[PDB]
Design a protein around this ligand. Structure first.
Ligand code: VG1
Ligand code: CO
Lengths: 561, 561
């Protein structure tokens, strides 16, 4: 195979976000070699005297253009001196699977072709995630460095005539002009290593008994036409024995059928209506790249992803992985509710509040202080790997149900009566007013500096809510010293209740007021019923503050979750 | 899992020969003790200290009792301290494949569950073959230890509770009672290691333009319902590109479709009929083990097994394996035609004539003195593994077609034109009277050893045959030193023609007589003729000197090849 140094011209907009670089597919196809440069800056962070004995795991969620970008990573990494590429069969390879492979075969980093929860039709979105040696997301330093190379790039080394059959399992060698050691491409099965990893984490026999034994827990699983389909089929059906009727929407389609892979009460309507039938005890849908999960109960019941980590923590020892390693620490993103906190507060385990993104959880994990973490964006995980994991979280819920023997509804009613209830809703104001929320979200910072307000008696609706705290958010990583940026306000008090007033930082075209609300109830009666209605006191104080409707301008709902 | 010991009673008939233990299915089935007993002695030949750090490859052919016999192997090997078992997917692993996997990963040996060539049903046949560290079939020194132990087995260690899921890929780990290190079961892909091996031997790229480009060679390969089916679909149909409709009967059926998977024009009648119509350019029939093959050309042109090895040898530097590592030696069995001699003699490289039996090819391949070996019983192999390979032979044939850009007919036609034709045929006498055939060989032997016979002139038309050499074949193996006596009665004639008699019934039940006739013709007008017409005078001479009709009561042979 030939090697040719193709001169190119840099791009401005090639910068990664909270997780990887994502753009509209047109920006990939119409732009004269956009992916070739972003790929070349990635391999450039790996020093020349280190590439010949290095292995890059390249994966993918099956999305449109995945096939062409994989061909580019092979031809570009080949001409740049990378010794081996471990691609999954057909390119299909989950984000928790890529995190898992990297840690297993000691790979110096990994590239994932996925825009996650972003839609994927031929007119939708496509993206490039870059995981580092430790297995998880490259933290800001490495990503912005990729950005810093994307601006001053002048050329890129490529082997234009290197065509590889990604469908066939096996090792293949390629010899390129003057380089003693041959370029190797090792195509691995997609599910294998990942299933062998989950095998030593849960009791696969105790689960086998729960899904196809003495009564059969009727589960309904929606893979949402994304990469986790083959996994539910080979793992939950073919291995653990769940009936084929359980695995719905499990064939990876480029278009994802049309729907958006983000699993939630709006973007995932199909499964909730069929869960309202009452014949299913448990139900679960997944993200596009399979690292997010949504838990549902009998009759369409819903477990908030902020509550889901709280239950898989009070019952954490139902999972063998934790009986052998121990619970070194709990964590949650600042926007996720305070339910995990109530469980962490009742035991000798430390708790950590991190910025939204899986990239900074890893630092707590590597330094041995975090074991269970997750966020409101349907993303529960643990330190078994360094990425989020949708199927680990589903199988963590089946381990709890099988040991406890109760329904999903009763586990949480008991959990709410045992600690109290933390209400939550992601009720946003997506792209809305061009001049209102400027001064409004700069009005509270200063105004509260008066010594007479620490003690407010009430006369609205019912039940007194005593005063205590109130402030803002920033983050200093305890392991390497990284810092964060101002962005989201949060009004708190005695027990624990809050509105994360989110001003956008990267919002150029407009500001999304992505709202995260939290209400902590103590009593038996006011906890078990109503969702965005028992939240009223929090959205009473939060709606009265700035005279918002006549001082900013927005009273029409947008996208509730 | 609990390890328990069962006191057992031994069996005097459990004796492993060249191809392991071949008994009928209804002797392992309900005879409480038979399968467990034999496996126990197999893993007893490996020292108690050499077991924890050791692996054994296990596989079968996909028919009756194979799956049941693999659950038995894991339960006994585990209680006996074997570290790792590498089992193919579903238990399906072809014989050439097991030799490849044992030598690749360097296992201590391997257990092959295949019945050689007899059918595999409820009342049919079932066998246990044990290969050793170099990937070859165990020899006398080791089969006797196995038999000496199996007839004195008092106690046997088993894990009754060990349940292995054979269909799911990946490493399953089992912890046993009272043991600090765990037992490992690793399920491997059936084709993979074996395909990656062929990928280095042949040129898969030159074979892609050959089977699926514009100038496309239409083939037709019948897997005969045996284990070689999965390998033909993945290598020939998936990776090389041949249309899926070319690989026919490629699904290992539980019964094999009633008939024996053996390369014989009648056994492979479907293949012969579909190739007579005119359309197909290359055809092939197989066996339920993966060790033999029946090559056919346009319109039904038959390629003789003996000529096959002389065509591959004269065009051997076409297969990259040979261009890169050289040809250390050629070898054929004694009954095989002298067609390989005309090639090895002109292209001056050491030729080795050995007794019927792969075991003799292996020795020369372990002492690095043998590269390509051929055998009249539909076989052709090399030092790529340490067993016979039916698909390697097909792959070496397609390689020669792509390189020479001629039809099967013309490559044999112009070979006969440049080296001459060794008309060959093999008459078999099936159920013969055990003593009347033995006294037939002895009087023939006394007829050969007196001073006068080494110059006798025989005739049946125009050509006279002058006896040059006459001997009962003795082999002194240059590796084991061991001498193999008897072996066969050779009447070598002065013109290169030979008549060979072998009695294969000298150990149990009724005897079979195999009469091999080989005749050399060098003028181009006579090489175009029919073999049974051409060999007619030499056959009258064979039945005359033998007085076969007289001693066996047989006026015609059972099978003519
Ligand atoms: O603030 P953002 O950009 O919307 O971030 C959201 O999606 C990110 C990537 O998601 V996946 O789409 O990588 O599962 C997640 O890691 C964050 O937890 C989630 O809040
Ligand atoms: Co995701």
């Amino acid at each position: 195979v030939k090697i040719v140094t193709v001169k190119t011209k840099a791009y401005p907009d090639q910068k990664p976000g909270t997780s990887g670089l994502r753009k509209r597919v047109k920006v990939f196809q119409s732009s004269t070699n956009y992916a070739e440069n972003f790929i070349q800056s990635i391999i450039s962070t790996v020093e020349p005297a280190q590439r010949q004995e290095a292995t890059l795991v390249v994966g993918g969620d099956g999305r449109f253009y995945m096939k062409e970008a994989i061909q580019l990573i092979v031809r570009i990494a080949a001409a740049n001196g990378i010794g081996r590429l471990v691609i999954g069969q057909n390119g299909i390879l989950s984000t928790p699977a890529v995190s898992c492979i990297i840690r297993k075969i000691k790979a110096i980093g990994g590239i994932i072709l996925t825009a996650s929860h972003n839609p994927g039709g031929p007119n939708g979105d496509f993206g490039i995630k870059f995981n580092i040696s430790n297995g998880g997301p490259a933290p800001e330093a490495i990503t912005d460095k990729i950005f810093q190379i994307s601006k001053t790039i002048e050329e890129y080394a490529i082997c234009p005539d290197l065509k590889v059959d990604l469908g066939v399992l096996g090792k293949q060698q390629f010899d390129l002009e003057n380089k003693f050691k041959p370029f190797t491409v090792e195509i691995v099965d997609s599910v294998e290593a990942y299933a062998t990893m989950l095998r030593n984490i849960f009791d696969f026999n105790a689960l086998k008994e729960l899904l196809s034994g003495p009564n059969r827990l009727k589960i309904r699983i929606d893979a949402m036409h994304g990469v986790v389909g083959p996994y539910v089929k080979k793992i939950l059906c073919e291995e653990l024995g769940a009936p084929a009727n359980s695995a719905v929407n499990c064939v990876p389609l480029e278009d994802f059928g049309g729907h958006h892979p983000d699993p939630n009460l709006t973007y995932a309507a199909d499964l909730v209506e069929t869960m309202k039938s009452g014949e299913h005890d448990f139900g679960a849908a997944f993200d596009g790249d399979g690292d997010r999960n949504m838990i549902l109960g009998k009759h369409g019941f819903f477990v908030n992803p902020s509550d889901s980590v709280a239950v898989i923590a009070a019952n954490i020892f139902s999972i063998p992985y934790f009986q052998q390693t121990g619970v070194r620490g709990f964590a949650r993103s600042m926007p996720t509710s305070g339910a995990l906190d109530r469980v962490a507060n009742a035991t000798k385990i430390a708790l950590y509040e991190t910025p939204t993104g899986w990239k900074f959880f890893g630092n707590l994990m590597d330094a041995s202080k975090l074991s269970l973490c997750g966020e409101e964006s349907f993303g529960t995980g643990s330190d078994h790997i360094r990425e989020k994991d949708g199927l680990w979280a589903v199988l963590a819920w089946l381990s709890i149900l099988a040991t406890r023997k109760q329904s999903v509804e009763d586990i949480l009613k008991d959990h709410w009566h045992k600690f109290g209830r933390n209400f939550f809703t992601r009720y946003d104001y997506e792209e809305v007013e061009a001049e209102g929320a400027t001064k409004m979200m700069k009005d509270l910072e200063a105004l509260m500096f008066d010594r007479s307000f620490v003690g407010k008696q009430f006369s609205a609706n019912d039940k007194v809510y005593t005063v205590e705290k109130a402030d803002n958010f920033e983050y200093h990583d305890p392991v390497d010293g990284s810092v964060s940026k101002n962005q989201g306000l949060r009004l708190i008090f005695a027990d624990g209740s809050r509105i994360i007033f989110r001003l956008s930082g990267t919002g150029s075209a407009g500001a999304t007021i992505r709202l995260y609300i939290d209400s902590y109830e103590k009593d038996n009666a006011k906890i078990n019923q109503d969702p965005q209605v028992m939240l009223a006191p929090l959205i009473s104080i939060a709606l009265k503050v700035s005279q918002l409707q006549e001082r900013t301008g927005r009273t029409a709902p947008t996208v509730i979750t």
